[PDB]
Symmetry: D3
Subunit: 237 residues, 6 copies
């Protein structure tokens, strides 16, 4: 693969994103294949997801006929993330550094989130004159509450790891990158020491409770952005 690295050891695979880890066309083309490959063979029972370098990611790098094609690309981009959100092997994210835009759309589709002390988070589509349509606003309501989500989505500001700990976006915070990565690996091993059919069944039962809302919200946002996205304020900044 030209956008990630995969290394498996002792029933846990680690998956690293190498690209400031910007997500381009190769990302959207490749993620479903990587996660389908990892979720098939029985040698893997849990996955750890981390980013290369000193950050996690920076985000993303007319008439009806031209807008239909935009609609189709937007749907494919949505499917690339729904691929990770519907896998039956548990995933743990380990976040160090910066996490902007599309990266936030990615860590809202994993099961567990660990951070370090120098981590910063934002949802910065509104500052670009964009209404986010990849999965942030469809899946963040199960993680956060109304007021914190509304402030984050309407202001476009940055928050640190202590506030993200307090509002519920991450489970734990540690001093450095290596401590958080070790904690994530310890939890992954703890999960991999259980029976695998029972784990997949728990995941199935929990996922059966939330699919319709996410699908409906994604449909509506694709239509809205196909209507109102391209404008002058998109070029004004």
């Amino acid at each position: 693969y030209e956008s990630v690295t995969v290394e498996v050891k002792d029933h846990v695979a680690q998956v690293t994103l190498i690209g400031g880890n910007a997500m381009g066309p190769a990302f959207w083309e490749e993620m479903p294949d990587v996660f389908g490959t990892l979720d098939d063979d029985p040698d893997v029972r849990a996955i750890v997801l981390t980013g290369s370098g000193k950050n996690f990611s920076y985000g993303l790098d007319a008439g009806a006929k031209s807008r239909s094609d935009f609609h189709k690309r937007l749907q494919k981009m949505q499917g690339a993330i729904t691929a990770v959100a519907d896998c039956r092997t548990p995933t743990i994210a380990s976040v160090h550094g910066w996490c902007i835009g599309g990266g936030v759309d990615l860590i809202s589709a994993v099961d567990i989130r660990y951070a370090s002390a120098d981590a910063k988070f934002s949802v910065r589509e509104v500052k670009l004159a964009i209404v986010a349509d990849v999965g942030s606003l469809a899946r963040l309501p199960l993680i956060l509450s109304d007021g914190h989500l509304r402030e984050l989505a309407l202001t476009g500001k940055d928050i640190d790891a202590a506030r993200a700990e307090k509002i519920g976006l991450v489970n734990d915070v540690y001093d450095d990158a290596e401590a958080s990565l070790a904690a994530a690996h310890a939890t992954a091993a703890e999960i991999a020491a259980n029976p695998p059919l029972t784990v997949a069944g728990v995941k199935d039962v929990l996922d059966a409770q939330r699919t319709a809302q996410v699908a409906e919200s994604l449909r509506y946002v694709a239509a809205w952005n196909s209507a109102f996205l391209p404008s002058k304020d998109l070029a004004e900044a």
Copy 2:
């Protein structure tokens, strides 16, 4: 009023549309006031709705900033049609002649439908390069079934009163234009001889079963039409 006539006699009001009865800008501004006035005073217990002349009706007479205004403008036409479907006084429609497009969107919001032998029906928006967004496809699934509705909406053909009787679009068919109007008045007078407070409660209980899906379908169709409506095929015919 500049678009209808109202005449009340012995607890039933008759409401006639006078414009071939095409529905223009005055229609969408005037209908909610007429139906709010009729549904308030206690002297009226049922309404009869018919069209003037020899027909019922003939139907309807860029950047983000203009499409926003188009969106807000579509929503208020939707609300004008929703006004009739939410009042608590029963309505009976008596259909004579031709009934094309928007008129079909109007008779799908009344309680009872009667016809005569010279009546013709169509949903002819697809032939205009339009996806209908005023209420037909959101309310028509409770009246018809999947195959009949799907053929009508995808072909754009005309059907006669016998087939409309068979498929469930009208309740009864009669020989001439005056027998149907007499039958509609007989049924309205039958309804107006029951306790007025039980009838509105039956309407309330029956309407509580169907509002959410209609509202959701209306939202989605407004968003779709704000994006894909203006095209070359709209000008091609």
Copy 3:
């Protein structure tokens, strides 16, 4: 049992109601016990339901503290009718004569309905100044369509077996009572020659599709009738 008779033969039980078959306190008291007894033992694989005599049935024979008791009574009667609709043994009804009010609430909970040529049907609560709250308006929407149901519920009139067959309320019509009872027994015997677990599973899968809306509608109508039922027009007739 002081309100029914039960006789089982060759894996089919026949259940007759002996009271013009009007149903009173014993009906609601003891129906769930009868149907729970019949749906337990393996010797019974289908049930036939018919009414004694020349008809099927004729129907039913302040401050907050007094209205709470009415609310609980209404819920109890609703549960007595819901008992029949939730058993896993199929039931076939055979209707001769008259079917008024609560009887219509009863035959909308069986799987199959057969009639004869001398049969008459009505939903007559509106003429009593009542909004029906035992299960007719919650379950008739899956049997009929919107316009026929609205006419029946708002007018309060009687219809005969030909119109009932046309609109979908019954499956077949026959010349006399004995022919219809024989047809019902033939179909019940046809169902009782299939594997029993497969039949109960088909029933379970089909019932899992409709329970929530029925329960919601029943809740709302109980609250509405506790608020608005006792009035002067109730005593005016």
Copy 4:
């Protein structure tokens, strides 16, 4: 393609199934690819579906680790039919002869159904000691009503084209197998003479109204059959 034939001529493609017309592993493997190919190129605007020969089709030809593989295989076979039910090019079926079991699961996923006078239909899974789990019971509720569906699914009998016309399973009935195949082509050409970008939008809006309940019913039936299917009565016949 070892299970179908495809021939396109003047914006309509005809797709014939050649295997009686039993549906085996090649069918489930190949069905999504044909419809993916036909929905891609713009040279095709409507599809006609018919069966080879003198009939339409005849149907289909432990511990936890053993049941899991069955569960996955059942899901894949469900997806093969959901592929046809979710394409944006309209399809018309033309039915001559016999239509048994899985074939009924196939014609409930097309838009329009035409028949001839020698056509016979059944849902025969219950006679095999099977609860159908490919799409019949999840999609037939939008086509039929409660009583007719319940009789068909619980008895396992066969019906002719007149009763299927009257209950709503087909739109029209013709005298021979060659008149229906020409009526279907006339309708397909009528659809293909409309603007191609409005037809797909109408389909999209109509499909947004029904997907969640179908998906839920399919999930539940897969879980039920993974538990109760393998038994003695399956081997007893």
Copy 5:
């Protein structure tokens, strides 16, 4: 306006309630018009809501025919509160002092809530022998969790700003009234520097996720209170 004051300066309007700020008939009559005026002007991009004096607010100041008028009268208060929650201009509340009864119902319909150290909150209808029916129990479940909501609604006690901040009712707490009002103005000015169409679209997408449940809960509570509200315990205190 006789119940509020409005002053706009640099794209933010401040709206103050002047009545201990108790809300009466003028409040319910005039509430929708103020927000209709403010949400339509293009010179306003965010709103700040604060209460006059040393507190925020103190709350609110038979046969079927009288119950009907009570029912229609309750629905208008519900609509007056729903007007604020459906506008497309963001609102920030700033709470100093006391917040009792209907005051809690009002601040559960804004986007963001800020408090000071001398603030006290309660839901006190249960101590009046009332089940709250103006919007608290329908919208408060998205803000809080199950146990905290149940304790607050069943006991009727007062809580201070520290516990409210912990349980998620407010975002931030400050030392005095002026600090909180300055913080609210800073956040409003931060929101008013983003593109306005993007902000309104984010609001629309987020609101499309919650409307049906709120509407259903409001219907049910109106019916329940029309049935059971007037009693002796209402006069006993």
Copy 6:
């Protein structure tokens, strides 16, 4: 009773479970009658629930015909917890010591939860090769959030009272057992001094918001466990 003790004083009944309080067949046979008795008589207005000894509880301790009996038995076990979750008298739990497995399923169905400093909580079904199907994963999502729920359910670890306080599983923590029991009694006495028909109405309105999803999740988990529960890994530990 052979599994609990009941003692009523000053309008509050205390209910103690005496079996390390393991829950056996007598528990599932007896709980519905115990709770039905207390919710009927008017002398009781609130209930306190605590466990005997030094802990709260330790939890609980083929072909289609055997699976069917297992399925019915699982449903009967679910009904005993649903009995507690659906009564109209408020309940307060007071937790001391250990709380493993089924005990957690019991405390996710009460209104309020109090703890002491030596309390420990877990969901250990996954470590037994079981997917929990008695009501934990169906009701626990209204109490917690996604990440904490997924960690608890997928790892099978123990947590202490401080972390349970932080994540929202309990409302308050106290130093010893007697302090928590006294706090629970003080709150119950506070609740029992309000009007009794307003408290039950608040409970009814709040419960109308959540029943359908709980019922659906329970159905699905019963089917899944009937399919995949008995295996070798169940005997491997």
